[PDB]
Amino acid sequence: MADFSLATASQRKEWSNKAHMEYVRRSRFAPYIRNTENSIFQGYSDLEKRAGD
Amino acid sequence: TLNIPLFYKLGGAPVTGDTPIVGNETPLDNYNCGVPVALRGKGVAITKNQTF
Amino acid sequence: MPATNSAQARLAAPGHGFGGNVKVSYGSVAFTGTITTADAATVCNLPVGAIVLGVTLESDDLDTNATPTITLNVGDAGSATRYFSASTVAQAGTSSSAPATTGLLWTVTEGNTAVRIAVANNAATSADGSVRVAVTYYLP
Amino acid sequence: MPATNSAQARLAAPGHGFGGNVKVSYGSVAFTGTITTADAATVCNLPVGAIVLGVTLESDDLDTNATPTITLNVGDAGSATRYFSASTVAQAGTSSSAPATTGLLWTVTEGNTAVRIAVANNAATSADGSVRVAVTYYLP
């Protein structure tokens, strides 16, 4: 063209602020981890109290 | 970085006698200059073995 | 060595808009009866400040003889033979559609703004037909 | 059989308005003094994105000899003989107004936007005159 002809290295760009993450697929063992006695994977909060190894 | 533009002057021949102002085109010249930017610094330490 | 740049030597340079994107003028004069050398007619009319690019002359068969002899001139009031001189495209044996070769790039003056067709040589046997002229030019 | 429709194969199609209703560029370079092969001058200048339609070259009588030998080249900075090669319309015996026959429908590149006239052969006896060039083209 021969109108106002802007340069190739003078053309603007733009960078976005919103970023994407990668999917993780949380857990398939999550409904089965409880602290009661009739659970498959049983937890113990006895060392969350006073002390121990 | 930071890019700065420039426009030149105008160049051709005055369209003598008969010629249009729609036939015979010009471009307008245009250029760029980009300045890159960097971090830099300096520091000084002071002990206590050399201070009392 | 003294061949400098033109009288044009400093400016920018034309494109899209209302300038002199080149133009036409078209006429279709109709000849009838007998055809002698006392014929003259305007087909089109031109500006004052304009330069011609090219003239196209297409006609029919006007002299249907075994030896055709009809002959046309295209010009204006100043020069009667300015664009075409002894055209012979109206003959029934040759071909039509001859482009102009003389006096192309020149500025029209005052009193020369009407294109005439004058008959140069008598027709041996006059037929009925028409002659078309298209003149291309532009303006500053 | 594999001759398909063109790279054009899908769209509508232009008319009245601001497009590339075809255009001109005209220059009148004036030669004077003695005429050697060290002559070069711009007559007009072209766009970047444009395709040429035709170049018309009309000149005066520049070499008034019994055997004329002046010879012109019309081109640009890339090819010195792109439009006309060995024109010989400036001779005082032959006719002027020769249309271009080589390199018509081609897109102008960058750095090729100025039409030069260079003298190819020396003039046997230099006269004073001028040379006119009209270049038709259009834009997308």
Side-chain angles (χ1 to χ4, degrees):
Chain A
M1 294 179 71
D3 291 333
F4 179 74
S5 178
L6 195 144
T8 62
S10 178
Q11 293 177 357
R12 188 175 169 83
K13 296 188 186 295
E14 183 69 28
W15 289 264
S16 180
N17 201 4
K18 266 64 186 298
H20 300 293
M21 296 294 173
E22 172 173 351
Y23 181 70
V24 164
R25 189 174 60 244
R26 178 258 183 90
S27 181
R28 291 287 189 267
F29 298 110
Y32 293 145
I33 299 169
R34 296 280 86 84
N35 284 317
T36 61
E37 291 86 4
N38 55 3
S39 65
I40 300 172
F41 307 108
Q42 187 177 3
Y44 288 98
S45 66
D46 292 332
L47 298 178
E48 187 176 0
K49 293 185 285 185
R50 296 181 66 181
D53 194 6
Chain B
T1 188
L2 198 149
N3 298 111
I4 300 100
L6 177 72
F7 290 108
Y8 275 178
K9 201 177 70 177
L10 199 147
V15 294
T16 302
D18 53 346
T19 20
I21 314 169
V22 80
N24 3 351
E25 282 85 351
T26 18
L28 183 63
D29 289 332
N30 193 1
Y31 295 101
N32 196 4
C33 181
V35 289
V37 177
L39 180 68
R40 67 185 187 176
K42 175 63 74 177
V44 171
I46 293 97
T47 63
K48 192 179 74 175
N49 196 4
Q50 300 293 322
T51 306
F52 69 98
Chain C
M1 285 76 75
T4 63
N5 293 115
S6 55
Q8 296 92 5
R10 199 183 173 182
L11 252 179
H16 284 178
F18 282 171
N21 37 6
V22 290
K23 297 175 184 298
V24 277
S25 66
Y26 174 89
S28 178
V29 62
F31 291 173
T32 184
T34 184
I35 299 169
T36 62
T37 61
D39 294 333
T42 66
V43 287
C44 61
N45 46 4
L46 268 69
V48 178
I51 282 191
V52 184
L53 261 291
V55 181
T56 302
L57 179 62
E58 180 179 0
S59 67
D60 292 333
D61 47 352
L62 273 69
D63 191 75
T64 61
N65 197 2
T67 304
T69 182
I70 194 167
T71 293
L72 295 172
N73 290 325
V74 176
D76 53 358
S79 178
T81 61
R82 182 170 287 170
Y83 299 106
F84 289 97
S85 300
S87 177
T88 68
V89 298
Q91 295 178 357
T94 62
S95 177
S96 65
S97 296
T101 60
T102 60
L104 277 304
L105 295 170
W106 64 279
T107 304
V108 180
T109 60
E110 183 67 30
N112 297 117
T113 65
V115 176
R116 298 293 183 94
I117 292 176
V119 177
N121 194 1
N122 291 316
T125 170
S126 296
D128 194 0
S130 67
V131 177
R132 279 88 65 192
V133 177
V135 175
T136 59
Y137 65 92
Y138 69 104
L139 298 184
Chain D
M1 285 76 75
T4 63
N5 293 115
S6 55
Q8 296 92 5
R10 199 183 173 182
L11 252 179
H16 284 178
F18 282 171
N21 37 6
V22 290
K23 296 175 184 298
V24 277
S25 66
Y26 173 89
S28 178
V29 62
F31 291 173
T32 184
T34 184
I35 299 169
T36 62
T37 61
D39 294 333
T42 66
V43 287
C44 61
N45 46 4
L46 268 69
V48 178
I51 282 191
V52 184
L53 261 291
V55 181
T56 302
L57 179 62
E58 180 179 0
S59 67
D60 292 333
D61 47 352
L62 273 69
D63 191 75
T64 61
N65 197 2
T67 303
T69 182
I70 194 167
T71 293
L72 295 172
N73 290 325
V74 176
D76 53 358
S79 178
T81 61
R82 182 170 287 169
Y83 299 106
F84 289 97
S85 300
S87 177
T88 68
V89 298
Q91 295 178 357
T94 62
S95 177
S96 65
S97 296
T101 60
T102 60
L104 277 304
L105 295 170
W106 64 279
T107 304
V108 180
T109 60
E110 183 67 30
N112 297 117
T113 65
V115 176
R116 298 293 183 94
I117 292 176
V119 177
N121 194 1
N122 291 316
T125 170
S126 297
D128 194 0
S130 67
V131 177
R132 279 88 65 192
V133 177
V135 175
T136 59
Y137 65 92
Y138 69 104
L139 298 184

